[PDB]
């Protein structure tokens, strides 16, 4: 029709059908057929070994440290508490200027914690301070939407996810957005860095996940398998795969090199959304926190559920596996954190 | 060794007792979320009560009111940040007739939210003077936008102000019942809606919110003891 809008709509559909054909072309088998001869992991019934209390409101984020002992949790009571999970003692309690917090990270060097929320600001806190007490060091501004997730690469570069449908790589010292990631239509809710820092994925409310090159700022692969907002994302320990959970009550495993979904973890008695996902050290176990007050542990190869964590009194808002694989922690809207193994 | 354990134990003690002092402050603050479309009188209402935040006291009772205006227009994922607020103050313009259908749809989406099942809403029907202006002028009639208004009967419980035209009484009680028809359709005693007729010069909004919060907590305690 000559009108350049109709020519872009046509080339759009042409690309979507070339992509659907190139995707079904390599789907010679399914993951279930591949894993039908494996032995099941058996029933895994882990129990709550510790419980970390103190928070006055609903918790939204946690991240284990590299030492596999400490972890930080952010609640909307205006606090960011750092715990020594071995002795259940609290190491720090950082009050926040804005009480609306949605994410928190723990630097791999254990030197810094980060957090942000509806203030559209990413706040960095230096655990190694010279005057005595942890206080604000940096504060990253620029987003027109809230802050949904953030994870350190090193002590100076950090990537953020925001509700302005963009992600950004920051230089903590200069405070400049060294790299911008645009292309999502809806709010980006979660990001996950690969184990080798070279790439990272992001799950947005457009029911899509995107793989981003940190240093180059380009989107390499876009996956569309979920029917609704992506709420959680996490890399396989190998680095070439990741799992996502969405509001459509389903978990999906995508591979980077095959560029499509491999397997879907769901049950027809599960209707409520998914809030957090994380793999074990070997990637055989996938832990997910649900709206149904439970946390389900899946066998990442057989789609069988191998246990439940019915210990929270409200929606499980976050979870995380230790770097040594010794235990998993779960944060919920009941104002309690629980350690399981 | 064991000394670092005693230092960690007294660090935890100082932490838990700071959080103990913080708990008493947080327990007595009544968080109120202000929501509503633009071109409403919400921001003027906040200006009158003396940006993002507001802190005000009525009779030794603290309130902390927040409007989410620095975000985008997708009110979906951040709504779950207000599941524990004491009340939502929904502000509506009573003189706009099509803007008002948007307000009804937003009120319906707030009232049936999965995460706001227990959040009561205070409905402010602002700009009643302009509504009276438009009704007495008779150039834009409600029946063209709400044909139900033709068959609407002034309620027998209506309390018109001295000199108020029966047309204005029927118009503002008609808007009152389109919002009560939504609030009573699925509230089922878990939460309630308290309508109020307001104008831009009215200064009794702060008292009305205090009375409504009193009623909200009264009806929460009554339901907690299985009376109401």
């Amino acid at each position, epitope marked *: 029709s000559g009108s350049e809008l109709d020519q872009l709509r046509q080339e759009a559909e042409q690309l979507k059908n070339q992509i659907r054909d190139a995707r079904k072309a390599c789907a010679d088998a399914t993951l279930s057929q591949i894993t039908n001869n494996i032995d099941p992991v058996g029933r895994i019934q882990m129990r709550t070994r510790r419980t970390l209390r103190g928070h006055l409101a609903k918790i939204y984020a946690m991240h284990w440290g590299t030492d596999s002992r400490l972890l930080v949790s952010a609640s909307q009571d205006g606090k960011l508490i750092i715990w020594d999970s071995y002795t259940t003692n609290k190491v720090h309690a950082i009050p926040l200027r804005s009480s609306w917090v949605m994410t928190c990270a723990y630097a791999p060097s254990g030197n810094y914690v980060a957090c942000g929320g509806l203030d559209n600001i990413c706040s960095i806190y230096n655990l190694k301070t010279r005057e005595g007490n942890v206080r604000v060091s940096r504060e990253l501004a620029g987003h027109t939407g809230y802050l949904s997730c953030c994870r350190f690469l090193d002590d100076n570069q950090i990537v953020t996810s925001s509700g302005d449908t963009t992600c950004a790589l920051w230089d903590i010292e200069t405070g400049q957005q060294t790299t911008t990631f645009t292309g999502h*239509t809806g709010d980006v809710m979660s990001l996950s860095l690969a184990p080798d820092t070279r790439l990272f994925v992001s799950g947005a409310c457009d029911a899509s996940a995107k793989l981003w090159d940190v240093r180059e700022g380009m989107c390499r692969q876009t996956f569309t398998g979920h029917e609704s907002d992506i709420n959680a994302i996490c890399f396989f320990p190998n680095g070439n795969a990741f799992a996502t959970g969405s509001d459509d009550a389903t978990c999906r495993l995508f591979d980077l090199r095959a560029d499509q979904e491999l397997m879907t973890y769901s049950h027809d008695n599960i209707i409520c959304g998914i809030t957090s996902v994380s793999f074990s050290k070997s990637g055989r176990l996938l832990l997910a926190g649900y709206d149904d007050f439970n946390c389900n542990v899946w066998d990442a190869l057989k789609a069988d559920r191998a246990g439940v964590l019915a210990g929270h009194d409200n929606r499980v808002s976050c979870l995380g596996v230790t770097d040594d694989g010794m235990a998993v922690a779960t944060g919920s809207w009941d104002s309690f954190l629980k350690i399981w193994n | 060794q064991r000394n670092e354990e005693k230092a960690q134990r007294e660090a935890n003690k100082k932490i838990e007792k700071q959080l103990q002092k913080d708990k008493q402050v947080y327990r007595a603050t009544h968080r109120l979320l202000l929501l509503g479309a633009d071109n409403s009188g919400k921001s003027t209402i906040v200006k009158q009560m003396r940006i993002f935040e507001t802190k005000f006291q009525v009779d030794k009772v603290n309130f902390h009111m927040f409007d989410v205006g620095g975000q985008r227009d997708e009110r979906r994922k951040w709504i779950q940040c207000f599941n524990d607020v004491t009340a939502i103050i929904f502000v509506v313009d009573s003189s706009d007739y099509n803007r008002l259908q*948007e307000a009804l749809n937003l009120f319906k989406s707030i009232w049936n939210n999965r995460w706001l099942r227990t959040i009561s809403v205070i409905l402010f029907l602002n700009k009643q003077d302009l509504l009276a202006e438009k009704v007495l002028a008779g150039k834009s009639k409600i029946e063209d936008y709400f*044909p139900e208004f033709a068959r609407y009967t002034t309620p027998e419980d209506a309390t018109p102000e001295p000199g108020e035209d029966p047309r204005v009484t029927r118009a503002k009680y008609f808007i009152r019942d389109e919002f009560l028809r939504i609030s009573t359709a699925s509230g089922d005693g878990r939460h309630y809606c308290y309508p109020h007729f307001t104008c831009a010069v009215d200064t009794e909004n702060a008292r009305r919110i205090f009375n409504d919060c009193r009623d909200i907590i009264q009806r929460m305690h009554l339901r907690q003891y299985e009376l109401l």
Partner: nanobody
Amino acid sequence: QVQLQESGGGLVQPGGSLRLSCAASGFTFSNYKMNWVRQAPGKGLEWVSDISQSGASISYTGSVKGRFTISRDNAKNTLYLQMNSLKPEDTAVYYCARCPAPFTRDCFDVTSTTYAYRGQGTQVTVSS
């Protein structure tokens, strides 16, 4: 991938009856509340009709009440909007929108700038 395509609509004299069909793919149509909204030139998005999960409950705005009808079919995965006795003010681009979450009576889909689950839309013009 969520996909919504509107079809139908065009130039027609006032008083004509016309049916728009929204085809949906990428989700289980039975689990989502649906809306038909429109954007007239010179004004923003406004909601027109609403249909529930099973079609038991429907709603319309007062502007188009008594003429517009909304009907969904879960079996063939398609929404429909019928207009009768069109008026000169009914000239707008019609969007079929999906309410964001399954198993919920909530909808936040009148967003003017960007919504992730609305179709391209069709032009419906009423003129003489």
